[PDB]
Design a protein around this ligand. Structure first.
Ligand SMILES: C[C@@H]1O[C@@H](O[C@H]2C[C@@H](O)[C@]3(CO)[C@H]4[C@H](O)C[C@]5(C)[C@@H](C6=CC(=O)OC6)CC[C@]5(O)[C@@H]4CC[C@]3(O)C2)[C@H](O)[C@H](OC(=O)c2c3ccccc3cc3ccccc23)[C@H]1O
Ligand SMILES: *[C@@H]1O[C@H](CO)[C@@H](O[C@@H]2O[C@H](CO)[C@@H](O)[C@H](O)[C@H]2NC(C)=O)[C@H](O)[C@H]1NC(C)=O
Ligand SMILES: *[C@@H]1O[C@H](CO)[C@@H](O[C@@H]2O[C@H](CO)[C@@H](O)[C@H](O)[C@H]2NC(C)=O)[C@H](O)[C@H]1NC(C)=O
Ligand SMILES: CC(C)CCC[C@@H](C)[C@H]1CC[C@H]2[C@@H]3CC=C4C[C@@H](O)CC[C@]4(C)[C@H]3CC[C@]12C
Ligand SMILES: CC(C)CCC[C@@H](C)[C@H]1CC[C@H]2[C@@H]3CC=C4C[C@@H](O)CC[C@]4(C)[C@H]3CC[C@]12C
Ligand SMILES: CC(C)CCC[C@@H](C)[C@H]1CC[C@H]2[C@@H]3CC=C4C[C@@H](O)CC[C@]4(C)[C@H]3CC[C@]12C
Ligand SMILES: *[C@@H]1O[C@H](CO)[C@@H](O)[C@H](O)[C@H]1NC(C)=O
Ligand SMILES: [Mg+2]
Ligand SMILES: [Mg+2]
Ligand code: NA
Lengths: 996, 32, 291
């Protein structure tokens, strides 16, 4: 009955916050100033559970090891091993002196699955191992008022309905119901995505518990001020608790690479069983009994299974995941390394993902001129002009008149990432002055503060007077900051290049348009002014006690505005542009305010400059918004309030007709609904986030991307890829590698699938033409799992043939990893030539040793006989059993060598899918070593002492090594003219039939 | 007699070829 | 939902008609070229070998030693009474010796009377075709006494004391070289050491050697071996209807109702052996005359 449990969690939360203080204390039974007796606290603590989310569901290591031993590819190898032991049991119980070929093959298939499981498991375990080294869960004790006294207890010992006090800096323990605040501002960024610190007031403000200010939330941090509140929700019943529990209990889906592997096996076994069955009937039609024909069916089906393609595909995926871990882009799931490339719609988060989630001084005003400050996370941008007197005055107004200072250990840390004590706005100002104006320590103590006035509840203004250390004037320096509407009313003089001027409207209106420019840009602006107090009316001995009008409120000298906002990360805009370049639809999904979300969207690239929303057109025409046709609006902003009242068809139309979409004020549950709406179209989805609200979105997405440091633990675990460096450009690297390894996997698969034809055709014509066996079993093992392993592994190292970040995302219903064109190439054209080359070397060996090829027909009848030691060749010679068997095995060895020789050309042509080898080039050193090792190993297997005894591989006469050369050269020339017609003629024949 | 083949010389040459091609390939993947 | 068979917009088994013809035409031309290439190279391969000699003969260095009753496991188990029990043996002996009858060797243009006494080798020039079809020395069934074919007693060789003839693996240009007069302990044998390839049978261990009482050999003129006057072989092309020498072996005093192992080892300098191939040079048999 867990379906209903998950459905009651996909719904946005309800509450009882809108209650009078008396109704609340009556419902919960709690003293508003004394809390409750510790007795009641322990009685609830041992009643419903400690205030902590239930730990994640532990995953034993034997379970995931058994997981790696299964899947889809390892399962095909399992059914192959089963068929091998079935054939061996049949052959054993029914005929005399049965052979151990099939048994050898079954144990080989079992070993293949075990080895693949051991290393794939070691890799996934290594990812989780280095992931556990990031859980730095430091216990945090809460301040609870019980029985009329203040005590600091563990966060888990907190219960429902008891007074809890929080101080600026402390973390909100459970979900509280504020009862009394003192200018308290909390941080709802990790939960509701609200960037700027939202204040918390005891009065109920909004019907939505998330938007209202009378509710403190789990995992939120009280930025500034102090407040009180009654615990309404505790443990897993909390807001972020229901979100995390929903995240763990969601479906992961089927990755694109996995679906491609499954469809690949569909074609492999399709042709495998077609061959096995048609040849089973063919063998019965010839002469072989049901006992023999059953072994033929099993042999042909089992022979058509790429035994080594499992290890090659695994190493391929592991190699690309290695490159991901090199750039601090760790993937938890191995196949998750491919999903980025196949993505065609990225749903991103604003706060903490698209942005830096930190107040930063954005723009400044001076000389009626806007100066943009550098807002990059690592300070690698344009520096404004810092040589004017207006700046030397404004910087002192900000560095002095501000309640912001660095803490103790803030020494070795950079100027931005260091911790600042106080308001977020004052922190941004302190960092900007400490960064672009030397230092604020000696600059603040240089002007000894006399009397200050903090921020006011009404007409919010902050002023202070300081002594003047200049060597030319002893007049007192008074400074004040505040909202521009509060400072314009108290100003008459204006600073410009060092001198003053009146409040003429020619430049005052120019100040108003600048205020609306920085404000309309989604930023928060402040005004800074100062004035020289006359030392004749207020001497150096007079003390301006903060009581009456000791300072002139008006007639001040305005220097300039200073705006601020959370800026996007450094490579975020460029990366968004790269994703749009690759044809990936970028859709912003955030719970922040739309006025800021739209500005960040236009600033990063989600909303292209020039495109207009459905509201922008109504504003440009001065007409109601209900009149404009939505088809004339490319982009659109969708509010969460309106999203709650939407159907499936409506969301489908929102995504179908609008190319640039921005979902604002959306709850985490709505984030999940949006991801589902994107998946309904049938496109690959990637969710990039950091907060707990991104957990149900990162889980249900085809691939989730969490920020490694600025992210929350729940969304980091529910994701499929972690960015340990928070460099969002890693998303671009990922979408590039995902396409790169996709094409390289195609090449490597066509390579392993090409060798199947010359591996099976010997047995096929052995059944048909009744000729001696041309190719042996152990030799086939030496090809699939011996030589070819290094070339197939090297095929992963191939680079881009054209620009992959230029082509559009692959269509999942069209561009299959193994389409019908690859089968027409490997099984149809190249493998066919390789099979003919093997048969040529075969007939050469037998014809030179006395058995003419025409004479080899119907010869296996007496050839395989172990007692007819007088088998006439074409010259009348009598061959014993072991003599002719020595020839057959020393005929299997060159067939194997022939395979390596034709694999040289097959590897060189598979390295390039469209380009010419002359164009791409043998710059792949792993491939060069692949051919050298392949050839040296093949020669060693034939000439090592004791191989005709152990592996029954006998030495070769040197002329055998040249029997395969013309076939390899032919393969190379044919595929080269193929890629040449593909280049010159990109229309359809060579392209839609062979280009795979 | 034509019923004899110097298999030891061919075998020795094949093993020397296998040794040289492998050490050369190792030099190939060690570009320094 | 799986009716991709056809549609009103033309598809059969997956693709259209015009597409099926294009692909089929391509595959026919492609595979046709592949066939012509394989045939041309196989023809060059045929041009690198001759018709009178195999280009390599080292894989048949030690000639084999076969027998007439090609048993399923080199075992001779039958009943001295039941005629159908030993039918499989006699059938193969008669068919083997069917080409040695006096009527089969009647043409004097292809047969040559070697002689009643084993003589030196008979080399008929070189192996080229400059000379005509060489002659083959005759070998009448009378040479194998008490084990002859259908001459006077079609005994079937099985009424107790069976017969098992041995044959030397026919090899082109092979010149048998018997051991020197300095015979390194070769088990009582006649002094006709220079013009006959000796072959001596024996048990295998202390048990088999005791169960096998007496053995009687039969050959050309009474020698247990192969005469050198019948070698070397000049291939089937130049010497068709060639008759390699034969030599019979009869086991008179056997222990009935007991399976005993016999090893007929052929001796000589040009006769090699092998621990892996029990037929190269030597020859084994498991006789059991169960009554
Ligand atoms: C037509 C058969 O041909 C022969 O065997 C074939 C088939 C199979 O037996 C093979 C192994 O065992 C098959 C194997 O199955 C499949 C393979 C592994 C397959 C591959 C799968 C893959 O993934 O890569 C390669 C390709 C072929 C293969 O590599 C091997 C190759 C060796 C085989 O030996 C070939 C035998 O002559 C058989 O006869 C007798 O065995 C026989 C008797 C049988 C019945 C009753 C009485 C008998 C008495 C006898 C007395 C003395 C001697 C034999 C007796 C014939 O019936
Ligand atoms: C071939 O078989 C005949 C029997 O048909 C053997 O003839 C006997 O020979 C012994 C001497 O060894 C005489 O004592 C008998 O009187 C003979 N019997 C008959 C009926 O002739 C003959 O010896 C055998 N030949 C060989 C070479 O063993
Ligand atoms: C043939 O073999 C038999 C054994 O089957 C030999 O005769 C036996 O001789 C032993 C003494 O050594 C006696 O104990 C047996 O009773 C004898 N058996 C028979 C049936 O006579 C015989 O000597 C052998 N003959 C030849 C010529 O080798
Ligand atoms: C039946 C088969 C063997 C025909 C063989 C024809 C091949 C070997 C010939 C046909 C055209 C030739 C190519 C013509 C163009 C180029 C580009 C140049 O920058 C390097 C040489 C290169 C790469 C030549 C290599 C050899 C080549 C590919
Ligand atoms: C127009 C040109 C390029 C066609 C080239 C055809 C050549 C490469 C073909 C024609 C006949 C072939 C040869 C046929 C006979 C032999 C002898 C054997 O023991 C090794 C293979 C070997 C040595 C083949 C090598 C390739 C070969 C020489
Ligand atoms: C197409 C070109 C570049 C490939 C270069 C590698 C060729 C020339 C090499 C690869 C394997 C080599 C063979 C390796 C093994 C043997 C056995 C040895 O006892 C004699 C040499 C001989 C017969 C070599 C002849 C040359 C050969 C065919
Ligand atoms: C071998 O030696 C014996 C005497 O030891 C002799 O009678 C015989 O003629 C010799 N044969 C040859 C071919 O030398
Ligand atoms: Mg966030
Ligand atoms: Mg294979
Ligand atoms: Na997932």
């Amino acid at each position: 009955k867990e379906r209903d449990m998950d459905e009651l969690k996909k719904e946005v939360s309800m509450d009882d916050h809108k209650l009078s203080l008396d109704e609340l204390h009556r419902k919960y039974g709690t003293d508003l100033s004394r809390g409750l007796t510790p007795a009641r606290a322990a009685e609830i603590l041992a009643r419903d559970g400690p205030n902590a989310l239930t730990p994640p569901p532990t995953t034993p290591e034997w379970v995931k090891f058994c997981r790696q031993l299964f899947g889809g590819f390892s399962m095909l190898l399992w059914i192959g091993a089963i068929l091998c032991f079935l054939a061996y049991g049949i052959q054993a119980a029914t005929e005399e002196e049965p052979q151990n070929d099939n048994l050898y093959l079954g144990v080989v298939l079992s070993a293949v699955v075990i080895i693949t499981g051991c290393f794939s498991y070691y890799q996934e375990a290594k990812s989780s191992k280095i992931m556990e080294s990031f859980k730095n869960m430091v216990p945090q004790q809460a301040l609870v008022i019980r029985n009329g006294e203040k005590m600091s207890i563990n966060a888990e010992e907190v219960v429902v309905g008891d007074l809890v006090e929080v101080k600026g800096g402390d973390r909100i323990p459970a979900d509280l119901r504020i009862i009394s605040a003192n200018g308290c501002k909390v941080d709802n960024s990790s939960l509701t995505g609200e960037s700027e610190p939202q204040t918390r007031s005891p009065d109920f403000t909004n019907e939505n518990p998330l938007e209202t200010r009378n509710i403190a939330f789990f995992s939120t941090n009280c930025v500034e001020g102090t407040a009180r509140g009654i615990v309404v929700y505790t443990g897993d019943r909390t807001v972020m608790g229901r979100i995390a529990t929903l995240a763990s209990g969601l479906e992961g889906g089927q990755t694109p690479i996995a679906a491609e592997i499954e469809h690949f096996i569909h074609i492999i076994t399709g042709v495998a069983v077609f061959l096995g069955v048609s040849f089973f009937i063919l063998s019965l039609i010839l002469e072989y009994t049901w006992l023999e024909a059953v072994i033929f069916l099993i042999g042909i089906i089992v022979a058509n299974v790429p035994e080594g393609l499992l290890a090659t595909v695994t190493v391929c995926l592991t190699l690309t995941a290695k490159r991901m871990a090199r750039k601090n882009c760790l993937v938890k799931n191995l196949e998750a390394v491919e999903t980025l490339g196949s993505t065609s719609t990225i749903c991103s988060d604003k706060t903490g993902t698209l942005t830096q989630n930190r107040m930063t001084v954005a723009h400044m005003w001076s000389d009626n001129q806007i100066h943009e400050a550098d807002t990059t996370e690592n300070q690698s941008g344009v520096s404004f002009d810092k040589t004017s007197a207006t700046w030397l005055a404004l910087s002192r107004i900000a560095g002095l008149c501000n309640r912001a200072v660095f803490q103790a250990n803030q020494e070795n840390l950079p100027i931005l990432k260091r911790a600042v004590a106080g308001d977020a706005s004052e922190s941004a100002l302190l960092k900007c002055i400490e960064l672009c104006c030397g230092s604020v320590k000696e600059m603040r103590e240089r002007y000894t503060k006399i009397v200050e006035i903090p921020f006011n509840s009404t007409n919010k203004y902050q002023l202070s007077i300081h002594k003047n250390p200049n060597t030319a004037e002893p007049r007192h320096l008074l400074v004040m900051k505040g909202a521009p509407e509060r400072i314009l009313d108290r100003c008459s003089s204006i600073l410009i290049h060092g001198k003053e001027q009146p409040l003429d409207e020619e430049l005052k209106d120019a100040f108003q348009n600048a205020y609306l420019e920085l404000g309309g840009l989604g930023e928060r602006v402040l005004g800074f002014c100062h004035l020289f107090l006359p030392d004749e009316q207020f001497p150096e001995g007079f003390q301006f006690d903060t009581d009456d009008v000791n300072f002139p409120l008006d007639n001040l000298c305005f220097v300039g505005l200073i705006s601020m906002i959370d800026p996007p990360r450094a490579a975020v805009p460029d990366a968004v542009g790269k994703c749009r370049s690759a044809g990936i639809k970028v859709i912003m999904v955030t719970g922040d305010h739309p006025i800021t979300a739209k500005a960040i969207a236009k600033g990063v690239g989600i909303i292209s400059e020039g495109n207009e929303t459905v509201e922008d057109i109504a504003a440009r025409l001065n007409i109601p918004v209900s009149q404009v046709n939505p088809r004339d609006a490319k982009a659109c902003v969708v509010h969460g309030s309106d999203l709650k009242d939407m159907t499936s068809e409506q969301l489908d139309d929102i995504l179908k007709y609008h190319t640039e979409i921005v979902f604002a004020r959306t709850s985490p549950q709505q984030k999940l609904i949006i991801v589902e709406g994107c998946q309904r179209q049938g496109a690959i989805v990637a969710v990039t986030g950091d907060g707990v609200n991104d957990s149900p979105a990162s889980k249900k997405a085809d691939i989730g991307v969490a920020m490694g440091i600025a992210g929350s633990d729940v969304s980091k675990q529910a994701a499929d890829m972690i960015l340990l460096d928070d460099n969002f450009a890693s998303i671009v690297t990922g979408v590039e590698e995902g396409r790169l390894i996709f094409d390289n996997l195609k090449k490597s698969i066509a390579y392993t699938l090409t060798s199947n034809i010359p591996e099976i055709t010997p047995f096929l014509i052995f059944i048909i033409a009744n000729i001696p066996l041309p190719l042996g079993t152990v030799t086939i093992l030496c090809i699939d799992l011996g030589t070819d392993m290094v070339p197939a592994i090297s095929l992963a190292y191939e680079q881009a043939e054209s620009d992959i970040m230029k082509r559009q995302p692959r269509n999942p219903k069209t561009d299959k990893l193994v389409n019908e064109q690859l089968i027409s190439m490997a099984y149809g054209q190249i493998g066919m030539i390789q099979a003919l080359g093997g048969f040529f070397t075969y007939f050469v060996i037998l014809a030179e040793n006395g058995f003419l090829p025409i004479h080899l027909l119907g010869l296996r009848v007496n050839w395989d006989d172990r007692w007819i030691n007088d088998v006439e060749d074409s010259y009348g010679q009598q061959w014993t059993y072991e003599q002719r068997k020595i020839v057959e095995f020393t005929c299997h060895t060159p067939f194997f060598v022939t395979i390596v020789v034709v694999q040289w050309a097959d590897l060189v042509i598979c390295k390039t899918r469209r380009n010419s080898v002359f164009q791409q080039g043998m710059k792949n050193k792993i491939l060069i070593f692949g051919l050298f090792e392949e050839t040296a190993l093949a020669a060693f297997l034939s000439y090592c002492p004791g191989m005709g005894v152990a592996l029954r591989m006998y030495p070769l006469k040197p002329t055998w090594w040249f029997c395969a050369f013309p076939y390899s050269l032919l393969i190379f020339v044919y595929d080269e003219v193929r890629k040449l017609i593909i280049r010159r003629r990109p229309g359809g024949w060579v392209e839609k039939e062979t280009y795979y | 007699d034509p019923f004899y083949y110097d298999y030891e010389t061919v075998r020795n040459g094949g093993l020397i070829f296998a040794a040289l091609a492998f050490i050369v390939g190792l030099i190939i993947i060690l570009s320094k | 939902k799986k009716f991709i068979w056809n549609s009103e917009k033309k598809e059969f088994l997956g693709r259209t008609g015009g597409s099926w013809f294009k692909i089929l035409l391509f595959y026919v031309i492609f595979y046709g070229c592949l066939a012509g290439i394989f045939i041309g190279t196989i023809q060059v391969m045929l041009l690198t070998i001759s018709e009178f000699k195999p280009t390599y003969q080292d894989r048949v260095a030690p000639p084999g030693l076969t027998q007439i009753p090609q048993s399923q496991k080199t075992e001779i188990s039958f009943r001295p009474n039941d005629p159908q029990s030993y039918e499989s043996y006699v059938v193969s002996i008669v068919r083997f010796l069917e080409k040695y009858k006096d009527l089969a060797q009647k043409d004097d243009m292809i047969f040559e009377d070697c002689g009643n006494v084993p003589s030196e080798l008979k080399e008929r020039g070189e192996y080229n075709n400059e000379r005509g079809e060489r002659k083959v020395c005759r070998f009448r069934l009378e040479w194998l006494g008490n084990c002859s074919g259908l001459n006077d007693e079609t005994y079937g060789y099985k009424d107790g004391k069976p017969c098992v003839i041995i044959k030397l693996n026919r090899v082109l240009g092979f010149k048998p070289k018997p051991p020197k007069n300095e015979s390194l302990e070769t088990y009582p044998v006649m002094k006709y050491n220079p013009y006959v390839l000796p072959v001596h049978c024996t048990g295998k261990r202390d048990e088999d050697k005791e169960k096998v009482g007496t053995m009687e050999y039969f050959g050309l003129g009474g020698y247990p071996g192969f005469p050198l006057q019948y070698y070397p072989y000049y291939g089937k092309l130049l010497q068709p209807k060639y008759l390699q020498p034969l030599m019979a072996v009869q086991f008179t005093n056997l222990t009935m109702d007991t399976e005993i192992r016999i090893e007929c080892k052929a001796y000589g300098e040009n006769i090699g052996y092998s621990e892996k191939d029990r037929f190269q040079g030597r020859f084994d048999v498991k006789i059991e005359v169960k009554s």
